[PDB]
């Protein structure tokens, strides 16, 4: 599913992540726009680790969802990596939060850094009535 702008918005405030470890909506909005245009099935293989980064967040299968293909990998999220391809959002939502409780927060995604940090990030969710 490629979600719109405010139709992700009040979803994920729903799901409860506006303010989640310190991060507002609009970082969460700013980073599902970078890594995936909103999209729920967007994947992404590198070649160079044998990885796969999966969903809307674009979680990566080296460590926090399991896809049997990735060697010598974990998965701290504890699902497939299939769960993170759901048009529903909960589990991708349930293991971005995950994601952030580690020592980098929102850092942890590189494309966060590139496009959202130190951005001015209100426009992804202004209008949306979050």
């Not at 799901?15 to 609009?26: K, Q, R, V």
């Not at 048009?87 to 980098?104: E, F, L």
Request: aromatic share 10%; proline share 2%.
């Amino acid at each position: 599913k490629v979600f719109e702008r405010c139709e992700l918005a009040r979803t994920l405030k729903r799901l409860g992540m506006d303010g989640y470890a310190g991060i507002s909506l609009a970082n969460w909005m700013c980073l599902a726009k970078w890594e995936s245009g909103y999209n729920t099935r967007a994947t992404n293989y590198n070649a160079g680790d044998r990885s796969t980064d999966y969903g809307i967040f674009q979680i990566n299968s080296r460590y926090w969802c399991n896809d049997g293909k990735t060697p010598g990998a974990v998965n701290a999220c504890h699902l497939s990596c299939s769960a993170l391809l759901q048009d529903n959002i909960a589990d991708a939502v349930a293991c971005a939060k995950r994601v952030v409780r580690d020592p980098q927060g929102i850092r942890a995604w590189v494309a966060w850094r590139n496009r959202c940090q130190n951005r001015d990030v209100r426009q992804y969710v202004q209008g949306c009535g979050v």
